[PDB]
Amino acid sequence: QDVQAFLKENEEVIDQKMIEKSLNKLYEYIEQSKNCSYCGYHPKLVVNGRSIDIEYYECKKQQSLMKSMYIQQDLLGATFQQVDISDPSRLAMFQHVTDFLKSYNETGKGKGLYLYGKFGVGKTFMLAAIANELAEKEYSSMIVYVPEFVRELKNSQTLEEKLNMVKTTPVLMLDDIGAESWVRDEVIGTVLQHRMSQQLPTFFSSNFSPDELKHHFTYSQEVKAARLMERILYLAAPIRLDGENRR
Amino acid sequence: QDVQAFLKENEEVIDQKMIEKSLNKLYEYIEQSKNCSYCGYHPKLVVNGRSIDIEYYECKQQSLMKSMYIQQDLLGATFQQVDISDPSRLAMFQHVTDFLKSYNETGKGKGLYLYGKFGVGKTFMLAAIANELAEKEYSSMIVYVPEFVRELKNSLQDQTLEEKLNMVKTTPVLMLDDIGAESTSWVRDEVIGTVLQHRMSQQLPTFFSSNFSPDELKHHFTYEKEEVKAARLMERILYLAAPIRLD
């Protein structure tokens, strides 16, 4: 059953033979089992090339499908109600969460979201609006601070067991990207290339308008400079967030 | 000169070791002003346990201003009280006005670095940003650094001062003090690791001014797998402040 869902998701990529090749994976995927326990990840299918693989994504009863490390969870006061349909921001921000809340779990083809604009508006009050009421639709989601992970993999013995769980689970919400030769392309720039044959969404939040984010990764003299920013313009839907000073 | 006399007087009892250990102190002692321009204090040597220290012997905003771990007799300096024939005091003049401007609620900008000798007064210069961010309804707090280790190791019976720093971390223009030969090593991955995250969980500007330099403040706290733990949490101090140059 899981295979069916994933297939429709990646049916453009997967072939009949791919199904029979990744049979073991898709069959192991099903088995009903909703997940693990504790005492931390869940298996998801992710087609690599011509083969379908199985990657693990990391796992008063709502915020439990909504855990977080490196940031906080007191901030999770950022929900659907008091935050109103206000600007080109929220004239289209809750919709591209709720039109999607009717097509949740892994079946049909998919995207994420992107968050930008200018000062005072929001990038951390709208990634907490595709979250807690998603602890109502059998599939959990994520809230993690991307920039809070960019100061410990320079200074960090098995660290090749950590990055195969925080990228191939049902949801990705890669936070703020726009400040300060970049490992960003191994740390944050290779959080996309398995979300192709495994079909996995990429929501983002940021600092610059849709003609500006392809120029924050290294300077010299490009043929290679915007690899990610094409893959970070497809698996999502970006909108104009600009309202009152709610920061 | 008195020290010389006493040293040789009791050199059979004192020895040399302690002398070589406290070399830095005794050398700094003789190198500085033995007198004072009030003739307000003078330096004198004191034996504290196994180490010899240097003690000094004497020769719109007031109910708004309530700075913790420090007095109100310390916050009473402006910038029009500050002289410019030295090559240090004007740097501050040019610095903060450009930061009266790039921040219109949420800015995530730069900082300032007053580090080196002992005479300038790096809390009277800071008791000026603290001085006139209070004509407004806001702030620029001043709290000492060793006091986060003076009343914060006896009382770890849960909470106590894990819950009075909770609101001293919701003021924007918060300034950090004497990190270096003033603060032992339990604190950095429980306080000054968790000091610069929750403000940067939405991104802001923070400050650091003590006495021990940048390419040295990363090293004064391994009291390698010790220098590197002094190269992650501090990769948010040199990542969030720009140096001032005591020429």
Coordinates of C-alpha atoms in Angstrom, one line a residue:
Chain A
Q1 CA 0.0 0.0 0.0
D2 CA 2.9 2.4 0.8
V3 CA 4.4 1.5 -2.6
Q4 CA 1.2 2.5 -4.3
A5 CA 1.2 5.9 -2.6
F6 CA 4.9 6.6 -3.3
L7 CA 4.6 5.4 -6.9
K8 CA 1.8 7.9 -7.8
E9 CA 4.2 10.4 -6.1
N10 CA 7.1 9.3 -8.2
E11 CA 5.2 7.6 -11.1
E12 CA 6.8 10.0 -13.5
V13 CA 10.2 8.7 -12.5
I14 CA 9.4 5.1 -11.6
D15 CA 8.8 2.4 -14.2
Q16 CA 7.0 -1.0 -14.0
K17 CA 10.4 -2.7 -13.7
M18 CA 11.5 -0.2 -11.0
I19 CA 8.5 -1.5 -9.0
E20 CA 9.6 -5.1 -9.3
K21 CA 13.2 -4.2 -8.6
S22 CA 12.3 -2.2 -5.5
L23 CA 9.7 -4.8 -4.7
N24 CA 11.4 -5.7 -1.4
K25 CA 11.5 -2.1 -0.4
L26 CA 7.9 -1.4 -1.2
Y27 CA 6.7 -4.6 0.4
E28 CA 8.8 -3.9 3.5
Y29 CA 7.4 -0.4 3.4
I30 CA 3.8 -1.5 3.7
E31 CA 3.1 -4.2 6.4
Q32 CA 0.7 -1.7 7.8
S33 CA 3.0 -0.7 10.7
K34 CA 2.4 3.0 11.2
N35 CA 6.0 3.4 12.5
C36 CA 8.4 2.8 15.4
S37 CA 8.2 3.4 19.2
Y38 CA 10.9 5.0 21.2
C39 CA 12.9 3.8 22.7
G40 CA 13.4 7.2 16.2
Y41 CA 13.0 7.1 12.4
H42 CA 10.5 5.7 9.9
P43 CA 11.2 4.0 6.5
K44 CA 10.3 5.9 3.3
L45 CA 10.9 4.9 -0.3
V46 CA 13.4 6.9 -2.4
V47 CA 14.2 5.7 -6.0
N48 CA 17.9 6.2 -6.7
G49 CA 18.7 6.3 -10.4
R50 CA 17.2 3.1 -11.6
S51 CA 16.7 1.5 -8.2
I52 CA 14.4 2.3 -5.3
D53 CA 15.9 2.5 -1.9
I54 CA 14.6 2.8 1.7
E55 CA 15.7 5.8 3.7
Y56 CA 14.8 6.7 7.2
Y57 CA 13.4 10.0 8.1
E58 CA 13.3 11.2 11.7
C59 CA 10.0 10.6 13.6
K60 CA -1.7 17.7 24.5
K61 CA -1.3 15.1 21.7
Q62 CA -0.5 17.3 18.7
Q63 CA 3.0 18.8 19.2
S64 CA 4.3 15.2 19.6
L65 CA 4.1 14.8 15.8
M66 CA 6.0 18.2 15.9
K67 CA 9.2 17.8 17.9
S68 CA 12.3 20.1 17.4
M69 CA 16.0 20.3 18.1
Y70 CA 18.3 23.4 18.1
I71 CA 15.5 25.9 18.3
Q72 CA 12.5 26.1 20.7
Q73 CA 8.8 25.1 20.9
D74 CA 7.3 27.8 23.1
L75 CA 7.2 29.8 19.8
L76 CA 4.7 27.2 18.4
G77 CA 2.1 29.9 19.2
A78 CA 1.9 30.8 15.5
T79 CA -1.2 28.8 14.5
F80 CA -4.1 29.2 12.0
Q81 CA -6.6 31.5 13.8
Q82 CA -5.4 34.9 15.2
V83 CA -2.9 35.1 12.3
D84 CA -5.3 36.5 9.7
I85 CA -5.6 36.6 5.9
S86 CA -3.7 39.9 5.7
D87 CA -1.3 40.6 2.9
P88 CA 0.0 39.1 -0.4
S89 CA 1.5 37.0 2.4
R90 CA -1.6 35.5 4.0
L91 CA -3.9 36.1 1.0
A92 CA -1.9 33.0 0.0
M93 CA -0.1 31.1 2.9
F94 CA -2.6 29.1 4.8
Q95 CA -4.3 28.0 1.5
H96 CA -1.1 26.3 0.2
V97 CA -1.2 24.4 3.4
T98 CA -5.0 23.5 3.5
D99 CA -5.5 22.7 -0.2
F100 CA -2.7 20.3 0.6
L101 CA -4.2 19.2 4.0
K102 CA -6.8 17.3 1.8
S103 CA -4.0 15.6 -0.1
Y104 CA -1.7 14.5 2.8
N105 CA 0.5 11.4 3.2
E106 CA 2.6 9.9 0.4
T107 CA 0.5 9.1 -2.8
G108 CA 0.1 11.7 -5.6
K109 CA 2.9 13.9 -6.9
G110 CA 4.1 16.8 -4.7
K111 CA 5.9 20.1 -3.6
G112 CA 6.6 22.2 -0.5
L113 CA 6.7 26.0 0.1
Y114 CA 9.1 29.0 0.1
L115 CA 8.9 32.0 2.5
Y116 CA 10.4 35.5 1.8
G117 CA 9.6 39.2 1.5
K118 CA 10.9 41.9 3.8
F119 CA 11.3 43.0 7.5
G120 CA 8.9 42.3 10.4
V121 CA 6.6 39.9 8.5
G122 CA 7.2 36.1 9.0
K123 CA 9.2 33.0 8.1
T124 CA 8.9 31.3 11.5
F125 CA 5.1 31.9 12.1
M126 CA 4.1 30.2 8.8
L127 CA 6.3 27.0 9.1
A128 CA 4.4 26.6 12.4
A129 CA 1.2 26.8 10.3
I130 CA 2.0 23.6 8.3
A131 CA 2.6 21.7 11.6
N132 CA 0.4 21.3 14.7
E133 CA -2.9 20.8 12.8
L134 CA -0.9 18.3 10.8
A135 CA -0.9 16.3 14.0
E136 CA -4.5 15.5 12.9
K137 CA -3.9 13.8 9.5
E138 CA -1.9 10.6 10.2
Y139 CA 1.3 12.1 8.9
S140 CA 3.7 14.2 11.0
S141 CA 5.8 17.3 9.9
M142 CA 9.0 19.1 10.9
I143 CA 10.2 22.4 12.6
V144 CA 14.0 22.7 12.6
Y145 CA 16.4 25.7 12.5
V146 CA 18.7 25.3 9.5
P147 CA 21.1 28.0 10.5
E148 CA 21.4 26.6 14.1
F149 CA 23.0 23.5 12.5
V150 CA 25.7 25.5 10.6
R151 CA 28.3 25.8 13.5
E152 CA 28.9 22.2 14.7
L153 CA 29.7 20.1 11.6
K154 CA 32.8 22.3 11.2
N155 CA 33.6 21.3 14.8
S156 CA 32.4 17.7 15.4
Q157 CA 32.9 8.8 16.1
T158 CA 30.1 8.0 13.7
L159 CA 28.7 11.1 12.0
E160 CA 27.6 9.2 9.0
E161 CA 24.3 8.0 10.6
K162 CA 22.9 11.5 11.3
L163 CA 22.1 12.9 7.9
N164 CA 20.2 9.8 6.6
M165 CA 17.3 10.5 8.9
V166 CA 16.8 14.3 8.8
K167 CA 16.0 14.4 5.0
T168 CA 14.0 11.4 3.8
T169 CA 11.0 11.4 6.2
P170 CA 7.5 12.6 5.1
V171 CA 8.2 16.3 5.4
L172 CA 11.1 18.8 5.2
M173 CA 10.9 22.5 6.3
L174 CA 14.5 23.8 5.7
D175 CA 14.4 27.1 7.6
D176 CA 16.0 30.6 7.0
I177 CA 18.7 30.8 4.3
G178 CA 20.2 34.2 3.6
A179 CA 23.1 35.6 5.8
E180 CA 26.9 35.7 6.1
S181 CA 33.7 27.4 -0.8
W182 CA 30.5 26.2 1.1
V183 CA 29.8 23.0 2.9
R184 CA 26.2 24.3 2.7
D185 CA 26.1 22.2 -0.4
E186 CA 26.8 19.0 1.6
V187 CA 24.9 20.1 4.7
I188 CA 21.9 21.9 3.2
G189 CA 22.6 21.6 -0.6
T190 CA 22.4 17.8 -0.6
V191 CA 19.1 17.7 1.2
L192 CA 17.3 17.5 -2.2
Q193 CA 19.0 14.9 -4.5
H194 CA 17.4 11.9 -2.7
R195 CA 14.0 13.7 -2.6
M196 CA 13.7 12.8 -6.3
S197 CA 13.4 9.0 -6.7
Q198 CA 12.0 8.9 -3.1
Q199 CA 9.5 11.8 -3.7
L200 CA 10.0 14.2 -0.8
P201 CA 8.8 17.9 -0.3
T202 CA 11.1 20.9 0.3
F203 CA 9.5 23.8 2.2
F204 CA 12.0 26.7 2.8
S205 CA 12.1 30.1 4.5
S206 CA 14.5 32.9 3.6
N207 CA 15.5 36.6 3.4
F208 CA 15.3 37.7 -0.3
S209 CA 12.8 38.1 -3.2
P210 CA 12.4 35.5 -6.1
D211 CA 15.1 37.2 -8.2
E212 CA 17.8 37.3 -5.5
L213 CA 18.5 33.9 -3.7
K214 CA 20.8 32.4 -6.3
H215 CA 23.7 34.7 -5.2
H216 CA 24.6 34.1 -1.6
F217 CA 26.9 31.0 -2.1
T218 CA 30.6 32.0 -2.6
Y219 CA 32.3 34.5 -4.9
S220 CA 35.1 34.3 -7.4
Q221 CA 34.2 34.7 -11.1
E222 CA 28.5 30.9 -13.2
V223 CA 28.0 27.3 -14.6
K224 CA 27.8 25.8 -11.1
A225 CA 26.6 28.6 -8.8
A226 CA 22.8 27.9 -8.9
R227 CA 22.5 24.1 -8.8
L228 CA 20.5 24.1 -5.5
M229 CA 18.4 27.2 -6.3
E230 CA 16.8 25.4 -9.3
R231 CA 16.1 22.4 -7.1
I232 CA 15.0 25.0 -4.5
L233 CA 12.5 26.6 -6.8
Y234 CA 10.6 23.4 -7.9
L235 CA 9.6 21.2 -5.0
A236 CA 7.7 24.1 -3.4
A237 CA 5.3 27.1 -3.8
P238 CA 6.7 30.6 -3.0
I239 CA 4.6 33.7 -2.0
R240 CA 4.9 37.4 -1.0
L241 CA 5.0 37.7 2.8
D242 CA 4.8 41.4 3.7
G243 CA 2.6 42.8 6.6
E244 CA 2.7 44.4 10.0
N245 CA 5.6 44.3 12.5
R246 CA 5.0 40.8 14.1
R247 CA 8.7 40.3 14.9
Chain B
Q1 CA 60.2 48.7 45.3
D2 CA 58.5 47.5 48.6
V3 CA 57.7 44.2 46.9
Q4 CA 61.4 43.8 46.0
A5 CA 62.4 44.3 49.7
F6 CA 59.7 42.0 51.0
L7 CA 60.5 39.3 48.4
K8 CA 64.1 39.0 49.3
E9 CA 63.3 39.4 53.0
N10 CA 61.1 36.3 53.0
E11 CA 62.5 34.6 49.8
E12 CA 63.5 31.6 52.0
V13 CA 59.8 31.2 52.8
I14 CA 58.0 32.5 49.7
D15 CA 60.3 30.7 47.2
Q16 CA 60.2 31.2 43.4
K17 CA 57.5 28.9 42.0
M18 CA 54.4 30.9 43.1
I19 CA 56.4 33.9 41.7
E20 CA 56.8 32.2 38.3
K21 CA 53.1 31.2 38.3
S22 CA 51.9 34.7 39.2
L23 CA 54.6 36.1 36.9
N24 CA 52.0 37.7 34.7
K25 CA 50.4 39.3 37.7
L26 CA 53.6 40.7 39.2
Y27 CA 54.8 41.9 35.8
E28 CA 51.5 43.5 35.0
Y29 CA 51.6 45.0 38.5
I30 CA 54.9 46.8 38.0
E31 CA 54.1 47.8 34.4
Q32 CA 50.9 49.7 35.3
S33 CA 50.5 53.0 37.1
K34 CA 51.7 52.5 40.7
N35 CA 50.2 55.9 41.5
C36 CA 47.0 57.6 40.4
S37 CA 45.9 60.9 38.9
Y38 CA 43.7 61.6 41.9
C39 CA 47.0 62.4 43.6
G40 CA 41.1 57.1 42.5
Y41 CA 42.7 53.9 43.7
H42 CA 46.2 52.2 43.7
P43 CA 47.2 48.6 42.9
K44 CA 48.4 46.4 45.7
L45 CA 49.3 42.7 45.8
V46 CA 47.3 40.3 47.9
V47 CA 47.8 36.5 48.4
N48 CA 44.6 34.6 47.7
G49 CA 45.1 30.9 48.4
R50 CA 47.9 29.8 46.0
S51 CA 47.6 32.7 43.7
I52 CA 48.6 36.4 44.1
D53 CA 46.1 38.9 42.9
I54 CA 46.0 42.7 42.4
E55 CA 43.5 44.7 44.4
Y56 CA 42.9 48.4 44.4
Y57 CA 42.9 50.4 47.6
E58 CA 41.5 53.9 47.6
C59 CA 44.0 56.7 47.2
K60 CA 13.8 60.0 32.2
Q61 CA 15.6 56.7 32.9
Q62 CA 16.1 55.5 36.6
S63 CA 13.1 53.4 37.5
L64 CA 13.3 52.3 33.8
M65 CA 17.0 51.4 34.2
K66 CA 17.3 48.3 36.5
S67 CA 20.4 46.4 35.5
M68 CA 21.0 43.0 37.2
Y69 CA 24.3 41.8 38.8
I70 CA 25.5 45.5 38.4
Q71 CA 24.8 48.8 40.2
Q72 CA 23.1 52.0 39.1
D73 CA 26.3 53.9 40.2
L74 CA 28.0 52.4 37.1
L75 CA 25.4 53.6 34.5
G76 CA 25.9 57.4 34.3
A77 CA 28.2 58.0 31.3
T78 CA 27.3 59.4 27.9
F79 CA 29.3 60.0 24.8
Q80 CA 29.6 63.8 25.0
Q81 CA 31.5 63.0 28.3
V82 CA 34.0 61.0 26.3
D83 CA 37.4 62.4 25.2
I84 CA 39.2 62.1 21.8
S85 CA 42.9 62.5 21.9
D86 CA 43.3 58.7 22.4
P87 CA 42.9 56.3 19.5
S88 CA 40.1 54.3 21.1
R89 CA 37.2 56.5 22.3
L90 CA 36.1 57.9 18.9
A91 CA 35.7 54.5 17.3
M92 CA 32.6 54.1 19.5
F93 CA 31.4 57.5 18.4
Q94 CA 31.2 56.4 14.7
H95 CA 30.0 52.9 15.5
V96 CA 26.6 53.1 17.3
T97 CA 24.9 55.9 15.3
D98 CA 25.1 53.7 12.2
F99 CA 23.3 51.2 14.4
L100 CA 20.7 53.7 15.3
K101 CA 19.7 53.3 11.7
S102 CA 20.2 49.8 10.0
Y103 CA 17.8 48.3 12.6
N104 CA 14.0 49.2 12.5
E105 CA 12.8 46.3 14.7
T106 CA 14.7 43.0 13.9
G107 CA 18.1 43.5 12.2
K108 CA 20.6 40.6 12.9
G109 CA 23.6 42.8 12.4
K110 CA 27.1 43.4 13.8
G111 CA 28.8 44.2 17.1
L112 CA 31.8 45.8 18.9
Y113 CA 35.1 44.6 20.4
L114 CA 36.8 46.5 23.2
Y115 CA 39.6 44.2 24.4
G116 CA 43.1 44.6 25.9
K117 CA 44.6 46.7 28.8
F118 CA 43.1 47.7 32.2
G119 CA 42.3 51.4 32.4
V120 CA 39.9 52.5 29.6
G121 CA 36.8 51.3 31.5
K122 CA 34.9 49.0 29.1
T123 CA 31.7 49.3 31.2
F124 CA 31.5 53.1 31.3
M125 CA 31.9 53.1 27.5
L126 CA 29.1 50.5 27.5
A127 CA 27.2 52.5 30.2
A128 CA 26.4 54.9 27.3
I129 CA 24.6 52.6 24.9
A130 CA 22.9 51.5 28.1
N131 CA 22.5 55.2 28.9
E132 CA 20.4 56.4 25.9
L133 CA 18.4 53.4 24.7
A134 CA 16.2 54.3 27.7
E135 CA 14.9 57.7 26.7
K136 CA 12.8 55.4 24.7
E137 CA 10.6 52.6 26.2
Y138 CA 13.3 50.0 25.4
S139 CA 16.8 49.1 26.6
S140 CA 20.5 48.1 26.3
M141 CA 21.1 46.1 29.5
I142 CA 24.4 45.6 31.4
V143 CA 25.0 42.5 33.5
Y144 CA 28.4 41.2 34.6
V145 CA 29.9 37.9 33.4
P146 CA 31.7 36.3 36.5
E147 CA 28.4 36.7 38.5
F148 CA 26.9 34.1 36.2
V149 CA 29.5 31.8 37.9
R150 CA 29.4 33.6 41.4
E151 CA 25.8 32.7 42.2
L152 CA 25.4 29.8 39.7
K153 CA 27.1 26.6 40.8
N154 CA 25.9 26.2 44.4
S155 CA 22.2 26.6 43.4
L156 CA 21.5 23.9 40.7
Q157 CA 18.6 22.3 42.6
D158 CA 16.7 22.8 39.3
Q159 CA 15.5 26.2 38.0
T160 CA 16.6 29.0 40.4
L161 CA 18.8 30.9 37.9
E162 CA 17.7 28.9 34.9
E163 CA 14.5 31.0 35.2
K164 CA 15.7 34.6 35.9
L165 CA 17.8 34.5 32.7
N166 CA 14.6 33.5 30.8
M167 CA 13.6 37.2 30.6
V168 CA 17.1 38.7 30.5
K169 CA 17.1 36.9 27.1
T170 CA 14.1 38.9 25.7
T171 CA 15.9 42.3 25.6
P172 CA 17.4 43.3 22.2
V173 CA 20.5 45.4 23.0
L174 CA 21.9 43.0 25.6
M175 CA 25.7 43.4 26.1
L176 CA 28.1 40.6 27.3
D177 CA 31.0 41.4 29.6
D178 CA 34.2 40.0 31.2
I179 CA 34.6 36.6 29.4
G180 CA 38.3 35.9 30.0
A181 CA 40.3 35.3 33.3
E182 CA 37.1 36.2 35.1
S183 CA 34.6 33.4 34.3
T184 CA 35.4 27.3 35.6
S185 CA 34.1 25.2 32.6
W186 CA 30.7 23.5 33.5
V187 CA 28.8 26.6 32.2
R188 CA 29.6 26.9 28.4
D189 CA 27.4 24.0 27.1
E190 CA 24.5 24.8 29.5
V191 CA 24.4 28.6 29.7
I192 CA 26.7 30.5 27.2
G193 CA 25.9 27.8 24.6
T194 CA 22.2 28.4 25.2
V195 CA 22.6 32.2 25.5
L196 CA 23.2 32.8 21.7
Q197 CA 20.6 30.4 20.2
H198 CA 17.2 31.5 21.3
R199 CA 17.9 35.1 20.3
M200 CA 19.2 33.7 17.0
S201 CA 16.2 31.4 16.8
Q202 CA 14.7 34.5 15.2
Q203 CA 18.1 36.3 14.6
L204 CA 19.2 39.5 16.4
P205 CA 22.3 41.6 17.3
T206 CA 24.2 40.7 20.5
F207 CA 27.4 42.2 22.0
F208 CA 30.7 41.0 23.6
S209 CA 33.3 43.2 25.3
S210 CA 35.7 42.0 28.0
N211 CA 39.5 42.1 28.1
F212 CA 41.0 39.0 26.4
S213 CA 41.3 39.3 22.5
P214 CA 39.3 37.4 19.7
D215 CA 42.1 35.0 18.5
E216 CA 42.5 34.4 22.3
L217 CA 39.0 34.3 23.8
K218 CA 38.5 31.0 22.0
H219 CA 41.4 29.7 24.0
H220 CA 41.0 31.0 27.6
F221 CA 38.4 28.4 28.3
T222 CA 39.8 24.9 28.2
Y223 CA 40.4 24.9 32.0
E224 CA 42.2 18.5 20.6
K225 CA 38.8 17.7 22.2
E226 CA 38.9 20.8 24.4
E227 CA 39.9 23.6 22.0
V228 CA 37.2 22.5 19.5
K229 CA 34.4 22.6 22.2
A230 CA 35.9 26.1 22.5
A231 CA 35.2 26.6 18.7
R232 CA 31.4 25.9 18.2
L233 CA 29.4 27.8 20.8
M234 CA 31.9 30.6 20.4
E235 CA 31.4 30.4 16.6
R236 CA 28.4 32.6 17.5
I237 CA 30.4 35.3 19.3
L238 CA 33.0 36.0 16.6
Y239 CA 30.2 35.3 14.2
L240 CA 28.3 38.1 16.0
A241 CA 30.7 41.1 16.7
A242 CA 33.2 43.3 14.9
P243 CA 36.5 44.3 16.6
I244 CA 37.6 47.8 17.9
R245 CA 41.3 48.5 17.7
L246 CA 43.3 49.8 20.8
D247 CA 46.1 51.5 18.9

